[PDB]
Amino acid sequence: VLSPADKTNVKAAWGKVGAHAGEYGAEALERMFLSFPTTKTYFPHFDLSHGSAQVKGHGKKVADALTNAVAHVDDMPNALSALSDLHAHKLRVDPVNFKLLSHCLLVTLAAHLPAEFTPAVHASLDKFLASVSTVLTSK
Amino acid sequence: VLSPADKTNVKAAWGKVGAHAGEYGAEALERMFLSFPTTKTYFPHFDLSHGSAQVKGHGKKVADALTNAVAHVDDMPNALSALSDLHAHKLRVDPVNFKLLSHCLLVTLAAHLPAEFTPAVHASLDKFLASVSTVLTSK
Amino acid sequence: VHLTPEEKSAVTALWGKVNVDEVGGEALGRLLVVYPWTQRFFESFGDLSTPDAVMGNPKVKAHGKKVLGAFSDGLAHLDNLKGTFATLSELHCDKLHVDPENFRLLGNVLVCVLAHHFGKEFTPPVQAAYQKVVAGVANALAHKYH
Amino acid sequence: VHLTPEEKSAVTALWGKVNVDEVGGEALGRLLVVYPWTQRFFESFGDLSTPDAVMGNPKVKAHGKKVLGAFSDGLAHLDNLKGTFATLSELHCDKLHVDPENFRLLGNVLVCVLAHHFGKEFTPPVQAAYQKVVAGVANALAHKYH
Ligand code: HEM
Numbered sequence: 333v334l335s336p337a338d339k340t341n342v343k344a345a346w347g348k349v350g351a352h353a354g355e356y357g358a359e360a361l362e363r364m365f366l367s368f369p370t371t372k373t374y375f376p377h378f379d380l381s382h383g384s385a386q387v388k389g390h391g392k393k394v395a396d397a398l399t400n401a402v403a404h405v406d407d408m409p410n411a412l413s414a415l416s417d418l419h420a421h422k423l424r425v426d427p428v429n430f431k432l433l434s435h436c437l438l439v440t441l442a443a444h445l446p447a448e449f450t451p452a453v454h455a456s457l458d459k460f461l462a463s464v465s466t467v468l469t470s471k
Numbered sequence: 472v473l474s475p476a477d478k479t480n481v482k483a484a485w486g487k488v489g490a491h492a493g494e495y496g497a498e499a500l501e502r503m504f505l506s507f508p509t510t511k512t513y514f515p516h517f518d519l520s521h522g523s524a525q526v527k528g529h530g531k532k533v534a535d536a537l538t539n540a541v542a543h544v545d546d547m548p549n550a551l552s553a554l555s556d557l558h559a560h561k562l563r564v565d566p567v568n569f570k571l572l573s574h575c576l577l578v579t580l581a582a583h584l585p586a587e588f589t590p591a592v593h594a595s596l597d598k599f600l601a602s603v604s605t606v607l608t609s610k
Numbered sequence: 611v612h613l614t615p616e617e618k619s620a621v622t623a624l625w626g627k628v629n630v631d632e633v634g635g636e637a638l639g640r641l642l643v644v645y646p647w648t649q650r651f652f653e654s655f656g657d658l659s660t661p662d663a664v665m666g667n668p669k670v671k672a673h674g675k676k677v678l679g680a681f682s683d684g685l686a687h688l689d690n691l692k693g694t695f696a697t698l699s700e701l702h703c704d705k706l707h708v709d710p711e712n713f714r715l716l717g718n719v720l721v722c723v724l725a726h727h728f729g730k731e732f733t734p735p736v737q738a739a740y741q742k743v744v745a746g747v748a749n750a751l752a753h754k755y756h
Numbered sequence: 757v758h759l760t761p762e763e764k765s766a767v768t769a770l771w772g773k774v775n776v777d778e779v780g781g782e783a784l785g786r787l788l789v790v791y792p793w794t795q796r797f798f799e800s801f802g803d804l805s806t807p808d809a810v811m812g813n814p815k816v817k818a819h820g821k822k823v824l825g826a827f828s829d830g831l832a833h834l835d836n837l838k839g840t841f842a843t844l845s846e847l848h849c850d851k852l853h854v855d856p857e858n859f860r861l862l863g864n865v866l867v868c869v870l871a872h873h874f875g876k877e878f879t880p881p882v883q884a885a886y887q888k889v890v891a892g893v894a895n896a897l898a899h900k901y902h
């Protein structure tokens with residue numbers, strides 16, 4: 333489970349992201365599409381080029397999901413229930429790909445929050461994204 | 472989560488393993504040690520040769536853990552709490568290795584229960600062992 | 611992928627007894643049932659809504675035949691799996707974009723099918739040899755990612 | 757592991773700016789802190805009980821210097837990683853029995869350290885080039901398993 337220190341760390345790192353949440357989610361998706369091209373196939377109706385309004389809009393959706401998970405960290409299976417259905421049933425997302433996006437979210441936070449991305453907060457964020465990934469693959 | 476059908480399938484497959492549970496756990500461990508030699512390093516104080524009394528005794532321990540999980544399938548985190556602490560904190564078991572032993576447990580069941588190991592029951596067993604592995608890696 | 615002669619012996623002797631019209635379809639079907647995200651690559655096969663629908667689907671059996679033939683091809687060329695699987699690697703990696711973790715999964719599912727079909731004869735040493743084989747195949751199929 | 761010249765360019769230019777006395781130690785420490793099962797292989801290093809204790813451990817810094825040196829080695833022989841890493845593969849696979857998934861993890865942790873240290877400069881294209889690199893290194897270090 334996420335410890336009290338993990339929940340504190342995650343909350344604090346997210347607090348520093350501020351209104352950049354949407355932009356950082358877009359950047360994480362771009363990092364994943366470029367670094368792990370196999371993931372691109374899940375978005376054939378997207379233009380994945382840099383500056384894509386569709387990647388921008390989706391990055392905000394993703395960030396908002398993660399923020400809802402942070403806000404309901406003690407109740408994530410419930411909070412993310414509908415997204416778990418979507419990702420397993422309709423989209424059939426390979427579980428490997430949650431590891432790839434989680435890593436790209438970490439890289440994005442590290443590139444943008446030098447003071448906050450300490451080894452401890454990096455550990456807490458990895459456990460948080462792993463927890464989100466476990467829920468999203470639960471169905 | 473495990474569906475009602477998954478719970479039924481796992482229950483029934485376990486029912487047919489019967490008093491061979493301890494033996495099958497020992498065989499799964501042997502299959503793992505031979506197939507995935509990296510796992511051997513977790514048991515330096517064990518003789519891992521065929522017919523080892525120590526592999527036999529540990530297979531029963533493992534089978535009893537899985538039977539407790541089957542019996543408390545709706546409460547696995549609590550039922551397996553003490554074992555989750557043991558595996559993450561003291562033993563520091565690499566999470567990859569739970570995948571390897573789960574596979575070997577499936578192979579052992581398939582080799583012994585030809586009538587019960589249908590594609591559906593195979594799917595349910597894989598989900599059950601994945602759920603056990605998630606708990607055992609949760610700390 | 612170095613099999614000892616004892617490993618080679620264990621592998622080839624069991625393989626001669628495999629029903630090559632059926633086992634590849636059994637493995638592909640189980641892959642689709644156990645790991646349902648793989649159904650994303652096989653939407654053209656039609657009804658996959660239930661395990662029975664999957665295992666009795668004629669497209670599944672027919673395509674599984676070709677899959678097993680590639681395993682059979684690899685078993686003949688253990689010393690050059692890279693070469694044997696180059697064409698399939700381009701297909702699966704550059705064209706299909708299948709994550710290579712799923713090559714490992716199919717190999718493990720094949721191993722479960724062999725265990726199911728051969729029982730006690732699928733001894734732990736025989737398994738350990740087959741694990742070297744399905745690892746070698748997955749690695750060669752993934753070479754266009756490496 | 758074929759990098760395009762633009763990929764090679766992005767990789768080499770950033771790497772020249774890397775503090776080679778520090779970055780390998782940052783990466784190894786984070787590995788031990790983020791993936792604590794890896795501490796199994798480093799019990800001789802002493803106090804690993806807290807993140808501060810790990811990051812400040814002199815043996816962590818010292819050993820990470822050698823690890824980074826091997827990465828630097830691989831960056832020089834990108835088109836022959838298997839040969840460069842043969843001895844380390846023997847060590848990590850035959851002697852240490854480290855599961856190769858942890859080679860992937862250390863490579864991803866290194867990438868996180870580079871992002872942390874270079875910020876904006878660690879662009880998504882630069883990352884994608886580094887991912888090809890750390891993937892190639894892990895695959896070469898795992899060759900003794902393949
Ligand atoms: C951190 C983990 C993830 C989160 C929080 C997340 C979040 C979301 C959300 C909130 C939506 C709904 C968008 C909407 O309603 O308009 C969505 C849709 C979607 N997700 Fe994810 N996701 C995650 C992981 C992934 C991964 C790893 C993949 C594939 C590689 C993926 C592929 C998709 C696709 C294809 C859609 C449908 C997009 C569309 O058609 O507009 N997701 N995701």
Ligand code: HEM
Nearest residue numbers: 510513514532533536537554562564568569572573603607
């Ligand atoms: C299906 C998943 C697993 C189950 C149900 C399980 C169960 C158990 C149980 C019940 C014990 C306690 C034995 C006792 O009290 O004497 C134990 C100990 C242990 N487990 Fe597991 N385990 C699992 C996975 C693993 C894996 C994957 C590894 C390593 C590859 C591992 C390594 C160990 C070790 C080294 C011990 C201590 C053995 C000793 O020193 O006597 N376990 N496990």
Ligand code: HEM
Nearest residue numbers: 648651652676677680681706708712713716717747748751
């Ligand atoms: C060891 C693993 C695998 C082997 C040996 C294998 C073998 C084959 C073979 C022999 C073909 C026929 C190619 C032809 O028509 O010439 C094929 C096609 C195909 N494979 Fe696999 N395969 C493997 C894994 C996978 C996995 C895991 C997936 C997806 C989850 C996948 C998706 C496909 C698809 C979609 C096709 C049809 C491609 C087309 O006709 O355009 N393969 N594979």
Ligand code: HEM
Nearest residue numbers: 794797798822823826827852854858859862863893894897
């Ligand atoms: C990309 C991945 C890795 C690289 C490039 C790397 C590099 C190195 C290097 C250069 C050495 C020094 C060998 C010598 O003294 O000649 C070493 C030693 C060692 N590595 Fe790694 N390493 C990697 C991954 C890992 C991982 C993931 C683990 C465990 C979690 C590990 C465990 C060890 C241990 C225990 C030693 C000391 C061996 C001894 O002195 O006997 N390595 N590694």
